[PDB]
Amino acid sequence: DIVLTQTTPTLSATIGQSVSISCRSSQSLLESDGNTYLNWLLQRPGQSPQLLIYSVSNLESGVPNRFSGSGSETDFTLKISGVEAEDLGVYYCMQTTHAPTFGAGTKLELKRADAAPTVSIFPPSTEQLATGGASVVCLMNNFYPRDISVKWKIDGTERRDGVLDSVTDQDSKDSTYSMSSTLSLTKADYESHNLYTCEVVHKTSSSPVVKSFNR
Amino acid sequence: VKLQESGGGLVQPGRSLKLSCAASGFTFSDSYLAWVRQAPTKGLEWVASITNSGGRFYYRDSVKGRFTISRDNAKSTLYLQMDSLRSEDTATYYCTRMDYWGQGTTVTVSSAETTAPSVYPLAPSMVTLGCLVKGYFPEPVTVTWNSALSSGVHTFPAVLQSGLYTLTSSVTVPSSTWPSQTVTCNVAHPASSTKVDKKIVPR
């Protein structure tokens, strides 16, 4: 099977900047007919894939001239000359020379000024604890860049087990990210400890952001 | 050109499903078509493809023996018979001519049954309040605040826990607003035909 590799999974750009998305193929994509069957697709948030360029370099009808493709037989590049808001999405390279395969995608997000997270810790509700379960929630709202690290400490010692993360898509209004971390525990286990701590590490601060509660 | 998938829905493993693709705006009998699926963990995938008049077809190794591609040129429809469905087949299904794609049809395969969510409150210049939406299946759930309150709303993507989905929704309001004013989240799960309203009461 042919492997299409998109080296950079995420690309940050400002409106008007030129960008290049690369795709590398494990074997030559040049077919017996002299044609190289490499296509480039854009998937905008909440929409279905859309064809931008076919056969390495051919622009599809209705696609703006800022899009262009080039490549060898194993190395392929999509170029956006002055990115626009409508260009934000995920870009997929794709081949049909061999059994068809897709690359893993390049997220084209928008570069904006660094923003620090707003951290909020929440203890489990008594109605939840009234059942077997207990969930401790930590929210990191409106932060940029996407890159962040959350750590759960229970009475000092880190807890890896039962932690589940979720990061929203980049915001429509402010271009930020917001993350939620839930630590699922049992009522008896939750009651065995005293201090619950959520520690957030982001580039906007040297020291971590620490939000705690006892009970 | 226009392409319209249908046939998607929830099924248990082993069950069968038949999708269809309504086509218009082009000469369907001259066009080569494909079925492309999009799973979270697997990414984009070529499922099956067929030739303009028939004659040649293709099925990826994962779907050989279970899936069947076909077309009715007189009816301008493309089809995919998916028999012996697995959790691995869970994805959104696209009917495509490469240059033109349809809106898709989602296919969910699971042993879990339609369960309504259990809603718990998340309470402590600005105040961040929330709703923990636990133990629901399938997706999606619509979360609103006081529907009215839209600015400051963060609905986090669901995560699968023991065959059931869990999400969180938060709202950032000025300290003056709450608790002086009522802050409530409105959680809807169409699959179970449920609406749950949970008033965020200070601890």
Partner: peptide, 11 residues
Amino acid sequence: QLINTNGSWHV
């Protein structure tokens, strides 16, 4: 050029 409709991978 869109798809290698004549690809040897077909059956």
